Amino acid sequence: NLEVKFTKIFINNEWHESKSGKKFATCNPSTREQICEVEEGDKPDVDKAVEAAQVAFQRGSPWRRLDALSRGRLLHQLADLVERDRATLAALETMDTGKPFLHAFFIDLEGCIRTLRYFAGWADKIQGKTIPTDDNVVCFTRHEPIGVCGAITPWNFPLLMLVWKLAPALCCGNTMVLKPAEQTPLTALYLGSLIKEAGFPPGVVNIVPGFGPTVGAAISSHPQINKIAFTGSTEVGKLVKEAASRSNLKRVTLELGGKNPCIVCADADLDLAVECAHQGVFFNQGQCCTAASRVFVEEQVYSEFVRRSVEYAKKRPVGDPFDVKTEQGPQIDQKQFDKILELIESGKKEGAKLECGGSAMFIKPTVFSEVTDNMRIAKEEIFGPVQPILKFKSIEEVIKRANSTDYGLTAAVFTKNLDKALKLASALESGTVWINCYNALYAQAPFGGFKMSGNGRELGEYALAEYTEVKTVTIKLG
Amino acid sequence: LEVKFTKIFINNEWHESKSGKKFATCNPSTREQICEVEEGDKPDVDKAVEAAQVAFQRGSPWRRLDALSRGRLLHQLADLVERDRATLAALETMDTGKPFLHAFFIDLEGCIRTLRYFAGWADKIQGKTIPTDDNVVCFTRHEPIGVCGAITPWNFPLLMLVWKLAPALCCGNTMVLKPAEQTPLTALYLGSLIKEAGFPPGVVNIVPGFGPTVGAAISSHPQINKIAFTGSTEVGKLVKEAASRSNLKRVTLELGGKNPCIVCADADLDLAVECAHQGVFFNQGQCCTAASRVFVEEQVYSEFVRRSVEYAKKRPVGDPFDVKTEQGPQIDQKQFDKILELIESGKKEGAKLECGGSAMEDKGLFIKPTVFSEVTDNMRIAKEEIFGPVQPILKFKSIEEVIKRANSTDYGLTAAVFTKNLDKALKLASALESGTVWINCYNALYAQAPFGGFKMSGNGRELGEYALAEYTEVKTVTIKLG
Amino acid sequence: LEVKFTKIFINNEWHESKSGKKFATCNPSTREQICEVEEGDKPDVDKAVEAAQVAFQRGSPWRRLDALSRGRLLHQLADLVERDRATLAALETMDTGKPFLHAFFIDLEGCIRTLRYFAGWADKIQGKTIPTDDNVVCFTRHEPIGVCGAITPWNFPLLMLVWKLAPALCCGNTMVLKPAEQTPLTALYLGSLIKEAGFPPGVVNIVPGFGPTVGAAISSHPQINKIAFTGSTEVGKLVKEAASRSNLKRVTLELGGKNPCIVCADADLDLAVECAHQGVFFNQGQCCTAASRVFVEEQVYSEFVRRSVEYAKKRPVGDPFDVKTEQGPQIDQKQFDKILELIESGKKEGAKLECGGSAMEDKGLFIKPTVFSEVTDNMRIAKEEIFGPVQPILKFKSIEEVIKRANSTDYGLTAAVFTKNLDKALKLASALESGTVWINCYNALYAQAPFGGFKMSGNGRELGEYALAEYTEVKTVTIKLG
Amino acid sequence: NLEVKFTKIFINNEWHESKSGKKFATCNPSTREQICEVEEGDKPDVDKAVEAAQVAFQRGSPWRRLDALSRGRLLHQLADLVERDRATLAALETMDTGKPFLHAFFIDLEGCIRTLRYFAGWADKIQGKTIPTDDNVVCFTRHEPIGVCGAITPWNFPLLMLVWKLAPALCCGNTMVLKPAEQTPLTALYLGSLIKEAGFPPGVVNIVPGFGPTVGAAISSHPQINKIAFTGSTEVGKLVKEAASRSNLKRVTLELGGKNPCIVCADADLDLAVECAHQGVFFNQGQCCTAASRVFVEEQVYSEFVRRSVEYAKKRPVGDPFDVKTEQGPQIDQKQFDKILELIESGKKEGAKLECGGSAMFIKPTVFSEVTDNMRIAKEEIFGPVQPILKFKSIEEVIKRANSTDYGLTAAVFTKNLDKALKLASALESGTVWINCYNALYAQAPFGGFKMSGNGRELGEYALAEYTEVKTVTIKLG
Numbered sequence A, D: 001n002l003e004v005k006f007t008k009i010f011i012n013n014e015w016h017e018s019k020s021g022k023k024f025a026t027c028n029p030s031t032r033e034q035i036c037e038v039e040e041g042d043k044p045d046v047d048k049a050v051e052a053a054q055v056a057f058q059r060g061s062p063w064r065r066l067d068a069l070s071r072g073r074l075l076h077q078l079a080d081l082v083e084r085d086r087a088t089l090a091a092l093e094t095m096d097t098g099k100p101f102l103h104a105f106f107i108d109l110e111g112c113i114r115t116l117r118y119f120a121g122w123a124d125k126i127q128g129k130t131i132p133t134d135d136n137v138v139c140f141t142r143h144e145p146i147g148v149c150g151a152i153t154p155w156n157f158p159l160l161m162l163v164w165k166l167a168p169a170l171c172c173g174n175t176m177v178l179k180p181a182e183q184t185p186l187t188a189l190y191l192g193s194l195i196k197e198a199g200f201p202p203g204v205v206n207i208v209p210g211f212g213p214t215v216g217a218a219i220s221s222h223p224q225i226n227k228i229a230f231t232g233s234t235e236v237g238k239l240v241k242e243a244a245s246r247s248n249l250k251r252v253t254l255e256l257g258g259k260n261p262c263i264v265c266a267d268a269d270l271d272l273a274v275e276c277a278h279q280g281v282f283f284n285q286g287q288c289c290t291a292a293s294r295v296f297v298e299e300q301v302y303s304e305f306v307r308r309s310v311e312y313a314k315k316r317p318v319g320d321p322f323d324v325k326t327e328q329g330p331q332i333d334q335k336q337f338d339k340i341l342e343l344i345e346s347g348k349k350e351g352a353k354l355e356c357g358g359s360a361m362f363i364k365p366t367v368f369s370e371v372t373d374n375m376r377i378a379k380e381e382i383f384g385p386v387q388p389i390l391k392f393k394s395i396e397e398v399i400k401r402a403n404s405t406d407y408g409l410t411a412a413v414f415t416k417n418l419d420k421a422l423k424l425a426s427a428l429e430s431g432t433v434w435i436n437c438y439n440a441l442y443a444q445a446p447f448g449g450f451k452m453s454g455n456g457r458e459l460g461e462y463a464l465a466e467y468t469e470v471k472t473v474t475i476k477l478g
Numbered sequence B, C: 001l002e003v004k005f006t007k008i009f010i011n012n013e014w015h016e017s018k019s020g021k022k023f024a025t026c027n028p029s030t031r032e033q034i035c036e037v038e039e040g041d042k043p044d045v046d047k048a049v050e051a052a053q054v055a056f057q058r059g060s061p062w063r064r065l066d067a068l069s070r071g072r073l074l075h076q077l078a079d080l081v082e083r084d085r086a087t088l089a090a091l092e093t094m095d096t097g098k099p100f101l102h103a104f105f106i107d108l109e110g111c112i113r114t115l116r117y118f119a120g121w122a123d124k125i126q127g128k129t130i131p132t133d134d135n136v137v138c139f140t141r142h143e144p145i146g147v148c149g150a151i152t153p154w155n156f157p158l159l160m161l162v163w164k165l166a167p168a169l170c171c172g173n174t175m176v177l178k179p180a181e182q183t184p185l186t187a188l189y190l191g192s193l194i195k196e197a198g199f200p201p202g203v204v205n206i207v208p209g210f211g212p213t214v215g216a217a218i219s220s221h222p223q224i225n226k227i228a229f230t231g232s233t234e235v236g237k238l239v240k241e242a243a244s245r246s247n248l249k250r251v252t253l254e255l256g257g258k259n260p261c262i263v264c265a266d267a268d269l270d271l272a273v274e275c276a277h278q279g280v281f282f283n284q285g286q287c288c289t290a291a292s293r294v295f296v297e298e299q300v301y302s303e304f305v306r307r308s309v310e311y312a313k314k315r316p317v318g319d320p321f322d323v324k325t326e327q328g329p330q331i332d333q334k335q336f337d338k339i340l341e342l343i344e345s346g347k348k349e350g351a352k353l354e355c356g357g358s359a360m361e362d363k364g365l366f367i368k369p370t371v372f373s374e375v376t377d378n379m380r381i382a383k384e385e386i387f388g389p390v391q392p393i394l395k396f397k398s399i400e401e402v403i404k405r406a407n408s409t410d411y412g413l414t415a416a417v418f419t420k421n422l423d424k425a426l427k428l429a430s431a432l433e434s435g436t437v438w439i440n441c442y443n444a445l446y447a448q449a450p451f452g453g454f455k456m457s458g459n460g461r462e463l464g465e466y467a468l469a470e471y472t473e474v475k476t477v478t479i480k481l482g
């Protein structure tokens, strides 16, 4: 029975009610019910947050004058603060999303805590180049901060996807306007308290909760935001990018979805393959940017693979989020709950042996078989617990079949063969290629999509590129 | 000079436009028609992208190549450009009004240097090996992006194409290039050389034609993975939106600017004047980096103004090929009147016209060099990109004043600062919001040094190791050991 | 303050010297004995290296650690140093004669900052993935070197130990440290903190004792893989030779210098004087970076000379702990006479002694600040490293003159340049043969910025990403696919 | 029947006879006989070369004022020149060394040509850092050239080991004093003609042929050489480093020998293993820094491995160097020819089944078996064609056995297992670890020894570190 203390617009380290007066409700996907009502922001609110962020970015600001090292100190402060109150946040995260509490505690917030500390290390190590040119010339580059950055996040990993942006952005010295999902604003607002407590100057991070077409679009078009980062649907990603282009040509980072392939070679540890490929599709209830939507399996192990797959889905406990016995919780919205089983009869019309589940109970873990490429279950991403298992003959074959999507966020390969591992790794068009593991993410390893799965990267030194503008200084001597 | 090349370049073959239509390119000095080249359209673009896709398919000759052999191919191309250095330089002038010696020693030097710089980057495109857990091996590969599209302007037709082609090819991509309608000759000549140098067919394809027509088919193509566009801010906005609405292709942008040139009291005044001067009027004022806003400190304001006027008047104008010219015709009459329109806004808003102000010879597209006096921030000549021979000079009191006044624009491509004061030079360099900040020089570009815009002057960078990031896709391989 | 720690630190345990011998450390101001600590010898060193080898064996707790957890351990250590910040600062002063506020705000700030800087480098020590052939996967790993040895001087006992310990530990090495005989207290205190912070036993071991005895056993040890030595040029020569004659251990060297401080005519003269002044006399003149040769342009020579004399005389000297002191005792009497000997060479070779020249109070080891006048290149005070409070000021005509005259030494650790002229500052910075070149500042060290010697002033660098190269071994993995 | 045109000391692009007047003879290891007599340099000659090199390094020199890019132009010129006259050089190389002519042509000179072109690319891409520090400070690093560098080379790969130093050193803008081996000075002197022809300013590269204790020691102690690079014996490497330390503390790079292990896992392609492990020990007549001195093989394939090993040695053609039918030529000096078979009875006293060869004929390819760690054939490096084959049980086992040497230049592993490849790679203490190949060197991949096999690296961007001195510039503003 947790009290929600932060419900307002966070601007200049002060709590605000919407200039409109409107508010909206977030509810608990597990136990249909509100938790509470949140200030509903809109264009004028973001106009205020932006101005706050520009003033904090002005030359001579307490933010801009700081030591590079103190900038990372502050980020270490925040990670400290997030470690204290870690349970508070993990709890809010589950009330907002129906995630298992243990999942929020040991995944979502470990991720936040490592990501914050990692980029704290980077703040005084952001370095440009001194460039050789002519004898009488001194030419060098500066990696300056971009300015006001906007973060727009989904509901599946609200706080994590938020600190994946904030951490690099702040370590590089930018200021920010954050807009959480409507469905899950709570952890984001809590972080604002922590951001004030740890001592970030007012205006460095402001937060405007609200809806997409209102607040998010107010950000994506704002003429004095210099960059956006967005994690969300592919289609909304296109709009955000079009918005940016029409307005002020702000720099855009995008992390979207994908038809993420999982390739099982005949020589694979099959018990590791089935277990990871199971955790790959069904983890966080199948709602995950990294979700495995296409399990390719070689003939030699196909049929037995299908069997092992099915026994694993059977045994998986599902129930109330607070449960120390849970893996899978509730999906967050029946908007797509219908789309899922709508797409489960998809693969009975075209022919697929459903050896498992096939309907709601939450929803029963479902497993398909004898799936082919043309079928829709192997065509459009599911956003839910369904395992479409396909058959392949050749290495070259599955390479073209995996790459035949317009996306390419992740890919996972299972084999003990050195040449099979490496040739597949080189050949798959995916931003991350895991080998004999799944959902192995590290603050120090970059993450992002090829093709229509996104632009740019989060998580690694490559993250810093999205949050810096390269300046060339060229000096001629007499 | 007779124009050998006038066709669509696909798979190292020359093709008549699928429509059969053709369009003409004209000479801004002779005001006459050089020739007719094939006018491409969406079907032609579709034909080139399929070539470039097939050229980038795994196993193709182009992908199985060594890293170093790619580098060697760029060197062989740069060799050839050096050979036919005078042909290209000629074609460029005919179609630009560029002084032939400017094309030979600036444009084409830059081309051969860029090609050679990035030739050496090929076998040094390196990713990372990243520490993680005891039992995990984690590294990144910098894969090529795929089919890249280049859309270039007329101000520096060949140079702006190379700037893209060199790093793109060095990273192992394939290309679909559209030169400007006004200036297609250099691009298609290069295509001859691209074949001769040994590049596999399909690696580089070229479809001349118009922006609404071929450019739009390239920006929206669902199978082009990356677009690089130099040109207007407006068409730049449109290009990024098409890229967005379609398949989210990565976008590089090099647009214009209202580039400040700030002269402090303690400047070499004669250097400031000379560099600021050719900074304005170089390449007939038609340049990305054109000096648009000469801020001068009050101490030296007036006799800076005087000293510039004399440079302007004595500056040779005439036939491009004549060895003594420094400024030639404007590109087309569409521009010629547009600048003259803005000159008249300078008078109409009240700037003392210290020089020029008119057109030179009624028949031609030339303009005599023009200078203005006590220009302020609000006037037209001080906020709109003129892109002609016009030197609008302003006055400032304090360095903090001029900082805020230079950064008050929506642009930020280049900036110059003249002073001898170490703290001033560096304080200014830190705080001016511009992609390149020259200091006691102007137009000092190197293939090693990145170039590109802050704010609405661009996205990304061309020319330096930073250019490889625009032509590669980061991939993370992460292996867990048993 | 009572000294808690006086023993050999091996495997996180305290050990009496295998011989049983002990030696004493004395206070340069009180001229009294602080305490007795164990005098180590080869057997003790042999004991510590075996600990450090076992700590570095694959599978050991220390090697199975995460990269980030190593970083976290360095942060936990830096936390602890901040806690017992006044204890350490005290121990340092007692054993140094350092003004206690100098130790607190300079030494220990630098220590905590360095520890924290390199804590963040741990999970960002990255190798390369290298393009080669279509069928080959080629990458480099930056493995740790192994057991590293650190040998440090007395001028900055704790700081110079950390400078090595932070990057070495961050890269995952194990360590055998020998503090100077004169100044062992800070080092062994740290060892307490090293245990408390959670470092596995054996990762860091400390054997106090003498150079001919413990230092020599470390430099020659066949199982130490890397040696880092700050100290004299001569002992530096000997250390590298022992490293050579034995097992070719990698060698970092930070030695002394005859560091030029060049003041141009157009300098902030008051800044030049103040910074050049504390550049000489800081830390009682006993500093790697000590200003040894003040070149001044003739235009400002004489009343530069005057303006410095007044700073010298009004500079407080006295008890280290007294809050108003700036300069304390020299380290031992071995030095006290050595500087006084060279002062008398200044008179004997003819320099006008504008200030000081004597010793302050007969009982103590203090010296009043001393300044010389029309010093030339050939004199003793202008070619030998004084390492005390002595400001030898020279005169120069041209910048090219002073370039050749500053680079005429065998050293090149640091150099300062004061001017407001952009070209002068940069021309000088380019051409002075020194590891660090300050400009309108002095003693401006950052944990992010590399430090170390040109020529005979050192090998390698401490403090910046460049420091990781001294503590890692590059390995190339090259896989051919079938 | 080739004429040797260059026999003198090369200083300031001019040909010189030794100030002493002494000369020495190089002879042809294949056909006992001189080729000719070479100017024999000594201390005063190097004193002249050094001064030449310092003057060419002075500020304002045509060398120092050059564009970074033109510096690489020149290196491209030299590689061009070496490609022309490639046959001339390959020929001199074989007259000097007894290498097969085809081996000199397609290995030694391809290596030289690629190495030169690779570092030509690097000259205008040597970049320092702009370092974040305080707001009012500008701090950046310059990677300046070190100055006069000395290269000292052996006889096994005279020209290649020489351009492995010259190429990085010149691209970074240093000047050089080269001392080839006494046994093989000829290609080095030829390169001097090419260095003049291609347009390098006088004094940038000078060459002083001569003996080790005379000329090499004159370099290693010279008070105005700022760095040495040395490839040669371990013991001479120690002396050079001691010399450097006693004199002026010049920067030293060392490439020495090694007891280079070759590890065959049970799952290995055995035909690739035996063939590479055969080419690994017997190539260039067993005289090679990369020579395989220790072949560890897992029980599961040991005995059959030994068999296959022996049949390969049988069939290998050996004869006159000029032969289009050759693999192996003559060893260059009977100084160690005796040491080899001296060490072949080594392993009969301690017990080793000699299934192959065992004596001179050149010398017969020899193969040992049932070798153990203690035996001297598995203890000291051979410098000749002998294959000591050992047996191992475990992965952990062979890891400690491989690493139990004081050296660590290279190591080669054969397995199709992904986990076995990677764990071995991480665990072996060697500067290069090849997997399913041998002697796979690339101008772009760094090369060098762990432990007593050397300091520093040649060949890769890491090469540039040895040829640059980091300068920190730190500027405080008012």
Ligand SMILES: NC(=O)c1ccc[n+]([C@@H]2O[C@H](COP(=O)([O-])OP(=O)(O)OC[C@H]3O[C@@H](n4cnc5c(N)ncnc54)[C@H](O)[C@@H]3O)[C@@H](O)[C@H]2O)c1
Pocket (backbone or CB within 6 Å): A152, A153, A154, A155, A156, A179, A180, A181, A182, A210, A211, A212, A213, A215, A216, A217, A220, A231, A232, A233, A234, A235, A236, A237, A239, A240, A335, A336
């Ligand atoms: N109609 C279909 O066939 C279909 C299919 C799949 C998903 N969807 C919808 O996509 C939604 C995904 O929700 P999500 O939050 O996880 O991902 P998302 O990709 O839709 O948006 C995530 C974030 O961006 C915000 N946003 C929404 N519109 C915006 C806009 N114009 N400008 C700026 N920001 C905007 C949102 O407030 C949220 O914070 C689902 O809820 C579903 O209704 C529809």
Ligand SMILES: NC(=O)c1ccc[n+]([C@@H]2O[C@H](COP(=O)([O-])OP(=O)(O)OC[C@H]3O[C@@H](n4cnc5c(N)ncnc54)[C@H](O)[C@@H]3O)[C@@H](O)[C@H]2O)c1
Pocket (backbone or CB within 6 Å): D152, D153, D154, D155, D156, D179, D180, D181, D182, D210, D211, D212, D213, D215, D216, D217, D220, D231, D232, D233, D234, D235, D236, D237, D239, D240, D335, D336
């Ligand atoms: N006595 C033994 O047990 C034993 C064992 C193995 C090898 N060796 C000897 O080592 C030699 C290896 O010859 P190599 O040229 O291939 O390798 P090397 O490691 O001996 O020397 C190679 C290069 O360094 C030069 N050099 C020699 N002495 C020098 C010195 N003091 N200072 C500077 N340079 C010096 C040489 O002129 C040559 O150019 C063999 O010829 C052999 O006689 C002896």
Ligand SMILES: Clc1ccc(-c2cccn3cc(-c4ccccc4)nc23)cc1
Pocket (backbone or CB within 6 Å): B106, B109, B110, B111, B113, B114, B156, B159, B287, B288, B289, B443, B444, B445, B446, B447
């Ligand atoms: Cl948009 C624009 C185009 C060209 C110049 C320009 C002016 C004068 C000299 N140059 C040299 C180069 C150059 C370009 C790329 C590589 C190497 C050199 N470029 C220039 C200036 C602005």
